[PDB]
Ligand binder design. Structure first.
Ligand SMILES: Nc1nc2c(ncn2[C@@H]2O[C@H](COP(=O)(O)OP(=O)(O)NP(=O)(O)O)[C@@H](O)[C@H]2O)c(=O)[nH]1
Ligand SMILES: [Mg+2]
Length: 164
């Protein structure tokens, strides 16, 4: 059995809490309250020859809580930086979170990038290939996800588990 600490970071309203609720509880709430104090959840997945347990910190994404984030990413072995594919500003914010992790988090941290709300592709503002290229150039594990439909939610956590 292996255990890893994972943190979710990203602009407010991109769907961080929804992503963790979908992965941990199989839930999705159309009306999810903005996170004030970082929330903690845990979930276990089954790989080829190992049981991986995730200790997950779901951080508040509003800027006024930015100064608290290092308390949650310090020592994290993995991070999922989330943006909303319908909001380019949220994608730019995600890149800045990635920069902060590369400079202040553990040098061996595994960073995944979630282009969330992919079910709203009819309102896309961030091109998939552009995000894929950005992730490849920055050594980030990228997937578009939908906490609403479950698209790639189990998949992104499992892919992270395999690389830990
Ligand atoms: N269509 C759609 N809506 C989503 C998706 N993920 C989250 N949402 C919606 O987006 C809103 C905000 O989601 P939430 O999980 O609270 O975002 P957050 O990133 O945790 N916000 P904060 O950082 O303020 O805590 C909610 O109304 C939620 O239902 C998704 O994949 N698709
Ligand atoms: Mg939240």
């Amino acid at each position: 059995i292996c255990q890893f600490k994972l943190v979710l970071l990203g602009e407010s309203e991109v769907g961080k809490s929804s992503l963790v609720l979908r992965f941990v509880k199989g839930q999705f709430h159309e009306f999810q309250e903005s996170t004030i104090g970082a929330a903690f959840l845990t979930q276990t997945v089954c790989l080829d020859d190992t049981t991986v347990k995730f200790e997950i910190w779901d951080t508040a994404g509003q800027e006024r809580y930015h100064s608290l984030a290092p308390m949650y990413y310090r020592g994290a072995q993995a991070a999922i930086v989330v943006y909303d594919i319908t909001n380019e500003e949220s994608f730019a914010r995600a890149k800045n979170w990635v920069k902060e992790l590369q400079r202040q988090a553990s040098p061996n941290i595994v960073i995944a990038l979630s282009g969330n709300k992919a079910d709203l592709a009819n309102k896309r503002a961030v091109d998939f290939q552009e995000a894929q290229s950005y992730a490849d150039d920055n050594s980030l594990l990228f997937m578009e996800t939908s906490a609403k439909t479950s698209m790639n939610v189990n998949e992104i956590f499992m892919a992270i588990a395999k690389k830990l």
